[model samples]
Target: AVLDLDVRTCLPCGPGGKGRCFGPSICCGDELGCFVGTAEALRCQEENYLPSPCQSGQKPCGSGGRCAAAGICCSPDGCEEDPACDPEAAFS
Candidate 1:
């Protein structure tokens, strides 16, 4: 059914997977629902799908609490749990 399939999310098309959609690219990220497309491909056509964050570089945090890409490492909502802004916590 899916064309130009690249990869799932974390695991293959089935079994364990990341299910993390970047920039609303993939939906559900499941073997039956989600899929990773290739260059010049169309995706995320299903309705009622809420988009998420984007994967920039593969790094999570950097100077001044940044994701090493666009988003910040920590935020007021969900990003605040990484603890990249405070290394002392890791000291414990």
Candidate 2:
């Protein structure tokens, strides 16, 4: 006769969970595996979790305009309001 055992108390895997690992895992064997560490786990979460602001030397364009550098604006013709074209405006 064979006896069957049901284990219902097992914790799920991943950080803070009942499982003993975090992030994704790689199959090492039939009963063994390796997973990304905490640092890498957190990095993975951070990669797509947060939104980035406009990078330096660039700003969001306005009124359906494409974003560009502070002194440069993207127009159908190309860069407009040239800094060298208007010295007085460039100072202000």
Candidate 3:
């Protein structure tokens, strides 16, 4: 079977873990298909694994207003909808 070498791309070993391999130093998992020794398997064997202050450009908004995801000026309407909120309509 094709083996995955990139540790970052490894599948999650845990219920919802970020990486496949888990251990102190030597890590291993069903990376595509585990192998005793391979470039990728060996590589795999070796590998392992927000909110904040306002942005620099971000200024203060009104009491009810807040910054928009699109970086538009803050809204005084208490998070009301704005055409400027999403130019590309990113969210649903």
Tens-digit lDDT track of model 1 for 1-92:
12222432322222243233323233222112223342211233321244432232223465343331112243222222233433322431
Candidate 3's TM-score reads 0.18
lDDT of 2 by residue, 42-79 (tens): 32343234442111111235523332322333344333
Q: Say which prediction, candidate 1 or candidate 3, comes out ahead on lDDT.
A: 3
How close to the true structure is residue 53 of candidate 2, measured as C-alpha lDDT?
19
| Tens digit per residue, CA lDDT, model 3, 26-85 | 122321222223333344333432121111112334423433323222332222232333
Regions of model 2 farther than 4 Å from truth: 1-58, 67-70, 82-92
The lDDT of model 3 is 0.29
lDDT leader = 3
What C-alpha lDDT, on a 0 to 100 scale, does residue 66 get in candidate 1? 35
Best by TM-score: 2
lDDT of each: 0.28, 0.27, 0.29
Where does candidate 3 stray beyond 4 Å? Answer: 1-31, 44-92
TM-score of 2: 0.20
Models, CA RMSD each: 12.8, 22.1, 18.5
TM-score list, all predictions? 0.18, 0.20, 0.18
Query: In candidate 1, residue 43 scores what lDDT?
Result: 37
